[PDB]
Known about the structure:
The PDB classes it as viral protein. The entry lists the keywords Hydrolase, viral protein. The assembly is dimeric. The entry is titled "Crystal Structure of the SARS-CoV-2 Main Protease in Complex with Compound 61". The structure is a homodimer. Chain A has a 7-stranded antiparallel sheet with strand order 5-4-1-2-3-7-6, with no helix packed on it. In chain A, strands 8, 9, 10, 11, 12 and 13 form a 6-stranded mixed sheet that branches. The first copy, chain A, has helices at 10-13, 53-58, 200-212, 226-234, 243-256, 260-273, 292-298, and strands spanning 16-21, 24-31, 34-38, 65-69, 72-74, 76-82, 85-90, 100-102, 110-117, 120-128, 147-152, 155-165, 171-174. Helix content of chain A is 22%, strand content 27%. Chain A has 3 domains: 1-13 and 99-196, Beta Barrel (Thrombin, subunit H); 14-98, Beta Barrel (Thrombin, subunit H); 197-299, main proteinase (3clpro) structure, domain 3 (Orthogonal Bundle), CATH 1.10.1840. Chain A is elongated. By secondary structure, chain A is an alpha+beta fold. In chain A, helix 3 packs across helix 6. The A-B interface holds A 1-11, 13-14, 114-115, 121-125, 127, 136-140, 165, 169-171, 213, 274-275, 279, 282-285, 298 and B 1-12, 14-15, 108-109, 115-119, 130-134, 163-164, 207-208, 271, 273, 276-279, 291-295. Residues 24-26, 40, 48, 139-144, 163-167, 186-188, 190-191 of chain A line the site of the ligand Cn1cc(-c2cc(-c3cc(Cl)c(F)c(OCc4ccccc4Cl)c3)c(=O)n(-c3cccnc3)c2)c(=O)[nH]c1=O.
Amino acid sequence: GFRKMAFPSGKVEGCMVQVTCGTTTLNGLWLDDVVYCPRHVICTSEDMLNPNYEDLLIRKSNHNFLVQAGNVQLRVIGHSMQNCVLKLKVDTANPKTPKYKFVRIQPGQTFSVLACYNGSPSGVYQCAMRPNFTIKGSFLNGSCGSVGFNIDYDCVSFCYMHHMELPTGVHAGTDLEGNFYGPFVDRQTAQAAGTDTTITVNVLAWLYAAVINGDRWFLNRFTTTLNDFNLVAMKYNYEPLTQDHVDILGPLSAQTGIAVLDMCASLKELLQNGMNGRTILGSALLEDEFTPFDVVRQC
Amino acid sequence: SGFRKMAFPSGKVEGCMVQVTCGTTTLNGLWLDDVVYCPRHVICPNYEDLLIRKSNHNFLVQAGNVQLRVIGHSMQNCVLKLKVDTANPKTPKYKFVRIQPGQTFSVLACYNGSPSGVYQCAMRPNFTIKGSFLNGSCGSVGFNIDYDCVSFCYMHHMELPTGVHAGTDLEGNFYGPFVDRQTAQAAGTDTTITVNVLAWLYAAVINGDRWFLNRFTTTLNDFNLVAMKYNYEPLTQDHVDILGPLSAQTGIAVLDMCASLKELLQNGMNGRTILGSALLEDEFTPFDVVRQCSG
Ligand SMILES: Cn1cc(-c2cc(-c3cc(Cl)c(F)c(OCc4ccccc4Cl)c3)c(=O)n(-c3cccnc3)c2)c(=O)[nH]c1=O
C-alpha cells in the first residue's frame, strides 16, 4: 500500500545528547567533535524578547555548558556561534558518527523528525516543509534541538533543527548552519507565518501514485493549460505549478501514460467536486506530503 | 503541540536485521543472541519433510557485509529458527509478546536485509495490518519499546489481495485465520476500533480542535447499538476506564465524548476536519495519545 514511512532513526539516535546551560536543558546533535544546538540554550527568560546573543555568549565559559551523552559527560573545550546555531567543541569525537552532510531543503520537501527530550529520542515521524516555511510537527516542551533528516544510502542529510513553536501551533526552525527557514527569528516577539497553501506538485505525485496502485475513479477526459490550471488552483490556496514541477513529474507521467496536464485537469475537477464520499489511497483528503521522489521510491 | 502518526525510534531493532537466502528466495531475518528468526516459507507445501532435507549450509545468512554460518535449524509454528555460530553483539533487552486487535506497534520495513523505513501500525479487528510493503519485505518486524526493553510482536509473512498484510508473532502463531500457503485468502470484514477513535478525539481537544463537542451524554447500550449499525466495535467498560486519564485531563467524560462520536457517526462532519483528517482516525491507542500529547 501507501503509508507515510519515516526513515530508520538509528544513525541519528547515536548522535543525540542533552545540552545544559544554567536552568535550560535541550537536545544537541553530536557529530565528530562538535555538538550543535539552538543558540537560545544560553538565554534567560528576561532576555527572550530582545536577546543579544553575541553579548550573552562572550560572557560564557566552556565550563558553563554541561553536555551529556547517555551517562557520560562530555567536556566542552571551545564554542562558537553560527547564525542561530551554537557549536560546542568537545574533547572526544562521537564514535557513532554516520556519514553525513548538511542540506537546506525547499518548501514541499519531506524529511523524518526524531523528536527528543533530554537527549533521549522518543519517536520518529515524516514531515514536510510547508510553503510558508513552517512545519506541522508534533513537539512538546523540551523538544528544541530535535532534528529532521533524510537517509540516502548510508548518508544522513541533516536539514532541520527545531527551535520554536509559533502561536498558531506550528513549528519553526533552522538548517544545520543556523539559518531559519522562513522569516522567523529566535525572539519571543510577535511573528506570524504566511498563509499556508497546498503543495500542488506533491498532490499530483500522489494522484499518479493512486493510478499506479490501481485507482482511476478521479481521472477525466480533459486536459488543461498550465496557466488555466494555476488560475483555478490559486483560488483553492494551491501553490502555483511551474514548468519545473511539470518536468519533475515526467517520469510518473511516462510510467502511467497520463500526461502531466491531463492529471492537472483531474485535480481541477477534484477541487470542484470534493471526494463525494470516496477515498484515494486510503485518504478522504488530497494528500500533499509525498514528493515525486518519494512516490517512485515506495512504488 | 501537534499530532502525528509516530513510530518508536527503530535503532534498537536496526541492529538485529539480517538477510536470509535459501536458493532463489531472499528475505529478512531477526538476529538475537545466536538465533536468526524468519518466516518458514523461505525454505520453498509440507514443511516437516521439506526442512528435514535442507542442510545447515542451505541457508546463507548475511548480516550486512559479513557471513553467518548456520550451525543448526529448528522450527516453531510458522517461524524458522536458524542457530548461528556467533551471538549478535547489538542484541537489545527484548521479549516476544503477542498483541491484541486494536493495539499498535511500529514496523521496520526491510528490503534485502536492508531496513529502509519505519511506520506505526495497528492490528486490525480482522487481524490484518494496512502496511506499505513491496517485494523483499518478508520478515520485516513489528515492535514496541517500553523503557529500554524491545517487545517484538509481529513478523510479516504475506500480502493479501485487498492490499493488506498477514503475519505471525515471533513464536510463529498467525494473527487471524490465515495459512502460509499459495491458497486464495481473503481478509474478513473489518470494523473500526472505537476506543482508539475516542482517544483520537481526546487528542483533537488537547490540540484546540473543539467544534464537535456537544452538551449531551449517552449510555454504553444506546451508543453500542449505533456502533453495530456503523460497523464499529463494541465499546466495553474496560475501554471507558482506559480512557480515564484523558477524561480528566480535558474535562470531557467518556460518555460525553461518545455523544460527540455518535453525532459524528450519524451526520458526519459539515465539511470540517479533526486534526487535519476528514475521517475518524482509529490507529492511535489511549496510551499513544498520552505518550505524545502530555510528556
Ligand atoms: C528553556 N527551554 C526552552 C525550550 C523551548 C523554547 C521555545 C521557544 C524558543 C524561542 Cl527562541 C522563542 F522565541 C519562544 O517564544 C515563542 C513565542 C511566544 C510568544 C509570541 C511569539 C513566539 Cl514565536 C519559545 C519553544 O518554542 N519550545 C517549544 C515548546 C513546544 C514545542 N516546540 C518548542 C521549547 C525547551 O525545549 N527547553 C528549555 O530548557
